[PDB]
């Protein structure tokens, strides 16, 4: 869910950039539902 | 209509090489020799054509055709008074057979560091299809020349033809300029090779008194090992191989499935060792004796020269099927010396034709399915470039597991310190250089073998019950040997050599010229099969 | 004088048979005679076979009259051989003949198609492609050969209308054949001879295709390569025959008129071909031959039949049958609300050692299956296993092929040799399993094919043979992520045993006895393969929670048993698969639910194929641990 929302963006007056967007990793035992949780943030997420 | 006549001369006095062709023979009969490489289809030539005139819609035949398209002088009714304005009617019109040959030279007589010449042979009439791909034929008839645009741009004055601007009445373009460049061609009235299934057929056609000495040879007792002593009489002491080739050179037979799985009965065989084993002199012995046998390398070899390619003679000219070195040895035997040399990408195109006994080609708009029906004599030396005798089979050859399954028998020489045996080796190679030929002492020539051979392939062996179980007990035995324990062989065994245990079996029985294949026989592969697995 | 006979047709006054076919006098006998043909002929039973084939062409709407020449020639010998002479001049007037034949029966029939084709059968001579002569031109031959190429479908001018670009005028109907293009000169309106354009709107069109028929290769002599020739199709024969398949073409060996590259005036040959046949749909089912599936399915033991009806010259492997049967018919994709998806596939691994048959489990299913692509991991590429937009260099266009396991959208895709395989077919499979998709973004085309294929595949051991030692994730090259996708893993060695092989070897020299040259309880195969189709596209099943407790139960132990012996990972992959094989044992006996009995057997053959993959020190599960099962 928060990686669907992710974090506010900022431009800086000096072009820093600072990103919002949120990476999560999963590593995992294998059974564990980890790539069934990525094709449903793909189906799910507007454009992913 | 009329019947069109073909002379035909033959015997000529003489017979000329590709290279030996002149411009001073030009449209005149003499004899050529070359191994055939390419055969175009039979096509419809143009030989007496039909003219309708636009402005007289008569008919006009018997336009004779003699070497190029050509219209009508003058009209059959007298008012038209046409000769330009012609249109040919292609029913109505008549046709001979044409089929372009392409010849290459003859391997004995290209010269010092040249190439080899080719050239186009134009068979007509009944002599279309008298020469396929790989055959070494001679052909009588006309030196010709045909137009060549290439010779463009090549050095020399290229002759020209201009029209005669004299006594032609000017007042006061009409240039008419043509290109006199041509290429020597040959147009062959006589073929001659310098379907034998059926053994009555062959044995008909054929000298009586070959038929007393192959007789007599069917006579002879020891008649198996009189055979393995005439195969590759140079070499001497390696019978197990010389037998293993004697069965290749006489094969089994092709059964076909209900469904069609189409079991192949060519043995094919692969002969690894030691350097200097004579592993290359059984090769060339292959290749000079047994017929349609074909001789490469491993490195001089690629995917396109084994199997078909899709060349292409001129640019912006349409594209070819040239035969590769698995179809110019078909129902023969292809001898690759130094496989493991040969690339990876070569090896998987060769195992397209263990396979399936076809090569599929599928490049530039040809998508041909040609046959290659070839039994493949492959010699390789192991990695490290000497046999590993505390090592498997596998891991001494770099041959892919693909390739190495379809090899029926595996010969695996290796030499030895053995003080009289190198005695008797050295003796018998300073006597074959002494001598020539009287070193070479086999109890058959190599005329009456092939004959034998050319006999024995017309059979069909069969295998009577007692064979089936024996059989069956013999490949239980190969099993049981296999994974004792302590044996560790070097391949292990599985169907595939019961498969090949059955034609071998068959070839022994065409070897003994016999119909059925006794019990003994099947012994016989099987230890024949059983010696070739070296303990590891 | 202006009409002749039977008897006066056979004394020629022309020079060839062309003239005089086209003369009038003879060619309204020539049409009259077969007009008669056409409604006395009758079998020996009574039945008027032209009258039939009248009814069904009109009953069927078809414009192609099967008109057969055993009839022709016994009934008329002379006007047999005139159509085997000059088929061009015939063929024109018997079109006619059988137009007007059908009319009489079905009046009012021009408005719905303008004439009829008659396609001639039953041909005596039979030549070969290497045979064809200049003899044979502009004769009707039959050759046999395969379809080695297809040049689409494209439309040819039949009844050409001219605008006239001085008037406006449309000028009418001429008819255009394959000889030669037509052109007008003439205006009726204005008389101009000026530009005069073909209207492609008011212009009628005849499909037209190009066939390369290629002989045999089996039956091309030994030392000789395979020739083709060209065969044109026209307006009913377009797309009846696919590349690979063995048909025999009857038709009129013709020049294609168009000489200076070969030296000579030499023309091209082509086939203007008149029927085309398959000398020897397959998947369909009839009202009757539905009955007999849905009764045959309620026999007991079914499931047992299938299993030993696949694969019938292969010996035991009773197994790896089973699994091919399960994965043959499938199970049935589910989505729970567009947001959780599980495939409906079963994929089958083949561990075997060399000799295995590995290869003929895979050809019948190639055999059986509907939809079923055959790929490799290394050698015939016939399919290149990964999509990729290719530009073809001879038609200059790009093509977006998808890979194997996209042409087997919903069938099945056998892989042979995945043991070895490149990176790109690797990973082509790898995301086709996990995702049932192939994504590409290749020369501007970014799209998603759909993959969703149950994969067969058949591998060889790490090193030659199996070891029974090391577990089955080091005893092959493929790694953990693309094992686990496999639904059933069929691991077979090379065993040792005294009867085993003894029997193989009976087997296998008792069929080379059956094959030689010389005359020296398992579902019928195309019953069965219609069977199979039936299936997969009729019967979805489903289970009910009545059925959920023992197959918890079943899991949990499968995990405690994994986790002491800690070999192998059983996950919730395996009660999935379970489920999966589960729907397939259900579908093979036509139910539209999963009885307990089906149940049953899914976890017998999970366990089974878990179980074998293991270490022999692991394997204690199957002796005393899953016992039960
Ligand atoms: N907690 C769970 N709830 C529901 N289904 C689950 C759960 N865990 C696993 N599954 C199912 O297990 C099957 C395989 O799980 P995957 O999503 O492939 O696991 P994974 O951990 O991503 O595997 P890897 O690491 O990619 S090999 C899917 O069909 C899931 O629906
Ligand atoms: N487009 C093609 N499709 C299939 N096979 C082909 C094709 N072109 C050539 N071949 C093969 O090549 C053989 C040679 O026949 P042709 O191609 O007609 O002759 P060719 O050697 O190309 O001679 P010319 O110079 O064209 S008369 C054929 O019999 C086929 O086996
Ligand atoms: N048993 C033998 N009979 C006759 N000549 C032999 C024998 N063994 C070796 N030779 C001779 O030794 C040489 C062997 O050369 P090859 O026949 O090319 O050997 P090879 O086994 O192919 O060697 P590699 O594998 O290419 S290093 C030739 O001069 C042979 O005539
Ligand atoms: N159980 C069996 N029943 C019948 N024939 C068998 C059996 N096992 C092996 N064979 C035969 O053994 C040969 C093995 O050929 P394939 O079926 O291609 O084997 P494979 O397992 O694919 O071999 P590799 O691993 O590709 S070298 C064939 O001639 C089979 O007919
Ligand atoms: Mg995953
Ligand atoms: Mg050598
Ligand atoms: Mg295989
Ligand atoms: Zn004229
Ligand atoms: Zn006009």
Wanted: aromatic share 8%.
């Amino acid at each position: 869910v928060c990686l669907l929302m992710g974090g506010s963006k900022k431009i800086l007056p000096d072009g820093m950039r600072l990103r919002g967007d949120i990476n999560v990793l999963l590593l995992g035992d294998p059974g564990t539902a980890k790539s069934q949780l990525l094709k449903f943030v793909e189906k799910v997420s507007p454009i992913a | 209509t009329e019947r069109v006549f073909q002379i035909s001369f033959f015997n000529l006095p003489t017979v000329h090489r590709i290279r030996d062709i002149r411009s001073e023979k030009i449209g005149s009969l003499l004899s050529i020799s070359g191994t055939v490489t390419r055969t175009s289809e039979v096509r419809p030539e143009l030989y007496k054509a039909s003219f309708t005139c636009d402005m007289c819609r008569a008919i006009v035949d018997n336009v004779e055709q003699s070497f190029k398209y050509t219209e009508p002088t003058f009209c059959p009714n007298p008012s038209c008074e046409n000769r330009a304005f012609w249109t040919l009617n292609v029913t109505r019109s008549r046709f001979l057979d044409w089929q372009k040959v392409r010849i290459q030279e003859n391997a004995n007589e290209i010269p010092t560091g040249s190439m080899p010449r080719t050239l186009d042979v134009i068979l007509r009439g009944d002599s279309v299809e008298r020469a396929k791909p790989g055959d070494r034929c001679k052909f009588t008839g006309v030196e010709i020349v045909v137009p060549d645009v290439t010779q463009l741009g090549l050095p020399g004055v290229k002759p020209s033809s201009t029209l005669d601007t004299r006594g032609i009445s000017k007042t006061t373009r009409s240039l008419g300029v043509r290109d006199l460049t041509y290429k020597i061609s040959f147009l062959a009235c006589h073929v001659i090779s310098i379907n034998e299934r059926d053994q009555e057929v062959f044995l008909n056609s054929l000298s009586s008194d070959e038929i007393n000495e192959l007789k007599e040879m069917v006579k002879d007792e020891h008649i198996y090992d009189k055979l393995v002593r005439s195969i590759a009489p140079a070499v001497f002491g390696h019978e197990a191989v010389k037998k293993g080739i004697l069965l290749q050179m006489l094969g089994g037979v092709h059964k076909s499935t209900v469904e069609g799985i189409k079991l192949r009965g060519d043995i094919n065989i692969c002969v690894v060792g030691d350097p200097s084993t004579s592993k290359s002199q059984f090769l060339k012995y292959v290749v000079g004796f047994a017929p349609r046998s074909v001789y490469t390398s491993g490195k001089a070899s690629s995917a396109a020269g084994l199997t078909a390619a899709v060349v292409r003679d001129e640019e912006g000219g349409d594209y070819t099927i040239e035969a590769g070195a698995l179809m110019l040895a078909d129902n023969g035997i292809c001898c690759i010396d130094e496989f493991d040399k040969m690339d990876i990408s070569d090896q998987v195109a060769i195992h397209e034709a263990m396979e399936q006994q076809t090569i599929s080609i599928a490049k530039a708009g040809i998508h041909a399915t040609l046959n290659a029906r070839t039994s493949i004599l492959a010699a390789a030396n192991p990695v490290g470039g000497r046999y590993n005798r505390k090592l498997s089979l596998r891991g001494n050859l770099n041959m892919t597991a693909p390739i190495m399954s379809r090899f029926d028998l595996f010969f695996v020489i290796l030499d030895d310190c053995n003080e009289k045996i190198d005695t008797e080796l050295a003796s018998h190679i300073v006597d074959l250089h002494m001598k020539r030929d009287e070193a070479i002492e086999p109890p058959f020539s190599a005329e009456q073998l092939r004959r034998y051979i050319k006999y024995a392939r017309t059979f069909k062996p069969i295998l009577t019950k007692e064979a089936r179980s024996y059989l069956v007990e013999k490949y239980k035995e190969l099993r049981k040997d296999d994974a004792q324990g302590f044996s560790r062989s070097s391949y292990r065994i599985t169907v595939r050599q019961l498969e090949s245990m059955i034609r071998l079996s068959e070839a022994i029985a065409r070897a003994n010229c016999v119909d059925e294949i006794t019990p003994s026989f099947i012994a016989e592969a099987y230890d024949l099969l059983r010696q070739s697995i070296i303990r590891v | 004088r202006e009409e002749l006979t039977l008897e006066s047709l056979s004394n020629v006054k022309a020079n060839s048979y062309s003239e005089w076919i086209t003369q009038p006098n003879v060619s309204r006998t020539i049409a009259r005679e077969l007009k008669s043909f056409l409604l006395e002929y009758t079998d020996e039973t009574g039945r008027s076979v032209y009258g039939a084939r009248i009814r069904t062409l009109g009953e069927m709407n078809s414009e192609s009259l099967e008109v057969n020449y055993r009839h022709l020639a016994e009934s008329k010998a002379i006007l047999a051989l005139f159509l085997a002479k000059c088929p061009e001049e015939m063929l024109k007037i018997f079109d006619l003949v059988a137009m007007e034949a059908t009319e009489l029966h079905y009046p009012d029939y021009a408005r719905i198609h303008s004439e009829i084709h008659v396609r001639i059968s039953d041909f005596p001579t039979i030549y070969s492609l290497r045979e064809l002569r200049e003899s044979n031109l502009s004769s009707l031959v039959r050759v046999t050969g395969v379809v080695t190429r297809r040049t689409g479908v494209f439309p040819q001018l039949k009844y050409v209308k001219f605008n006239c670009l001085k008037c406006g005028s449309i000028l009418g109907p001429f008819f255009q054949d394959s000889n030669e293009e037509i052109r007008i000169s003439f205006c009726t309106n204005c008389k101009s001879k000026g530009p005069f354009r073909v209207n492609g709107e008011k212009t009628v069109y005849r499909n037209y295709q190009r066939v390369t028929l290629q002989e045999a290769p089996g039956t091309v002599p030994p030392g000789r390569l395979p020739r083709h020739r060209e065969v044109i199709l026209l307006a009913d024969l377009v797309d009846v025959s696919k590349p690979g398949e063995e048909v025999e073409v009857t038709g009129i060996y013709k020049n294609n008129y168009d000489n200076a590259k070969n030296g000579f005036p030499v023309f091209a040959t082509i086939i203007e071909a008149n029927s085309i046949k398959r000398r020897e749909d397959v998947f369909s089912w009839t009202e009757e031959e539905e009955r007999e599936f849905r009764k045959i399915s309620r026999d007991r033991g079914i499931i047992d039949k299938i299993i030993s009806s696949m694969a019938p010259s292969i010996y035991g492997h009773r197994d790896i049958k089973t699994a091919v049967a399960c994965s043959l018919f499938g199970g049935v994709p589910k989505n729970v609300n567009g947001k959780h998806s599980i495939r409906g596939d079963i994929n089958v691994l083949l561990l075997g050692d060399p000799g295995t048959a590995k290869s003929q489990i895979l050809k019948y299913v190639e055999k059986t299956a509907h939809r079923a692509v055959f790929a490799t991991g290394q050698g015939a590429s016939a399919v290149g296993l990964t999509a990729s937009v290719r530009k073809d260099p001879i038609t200059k266009e790009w093509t977006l092929e998808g890979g194997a396991l996209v042409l087997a959208d919903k069938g099945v895709c056998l892989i042979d040799e995945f043991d070895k395989m490149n990176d790109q077919d690797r990973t082509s499979i790898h995301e086709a399993m996990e995702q049932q998709s192939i994504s590409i973004s290749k020369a501007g085309i970014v799209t998603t094919l759909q993959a969703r294929c149950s994969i067969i595949a058949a591998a060889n051991p790490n090193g030659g043979r199996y070891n029974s030692t090391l577990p089955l994730a080091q005893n092959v090259s493929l790694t953990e992520p693309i094992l686990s996708r496999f639904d059933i893993l069929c691991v077979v060695r090379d065993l040792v045993d005294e009867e085993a092989d003894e029997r193989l070897a009976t087997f296998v020299v008792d069929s080379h006895v059956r094959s030689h040259p010389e005359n020296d309880s398992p579902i019928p195969q195309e019953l069965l393969m219609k069977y199979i189709h039936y299936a997969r596209t009729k019967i979805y099943p489903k289970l009910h929670q009545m059925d959920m407790d023992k197959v918890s139960r079943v899991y949990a132990d499968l995990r405690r048993e994994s986790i002491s012996t800690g070999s192998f990972p059983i996950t919730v992959r395996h009660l999935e698969s379970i489920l999966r094989i589960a729907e397939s044992f259900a579908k093979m006996r036509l139910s539209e639910f999963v009885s307990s009995y089906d149940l049953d057997r899914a976890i017998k053959v999970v366990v089974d194929s878990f179980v074998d993959a293991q270490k022999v020190s692991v394997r204690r599960q199957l002796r005393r641990s899953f016992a039960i099962y």
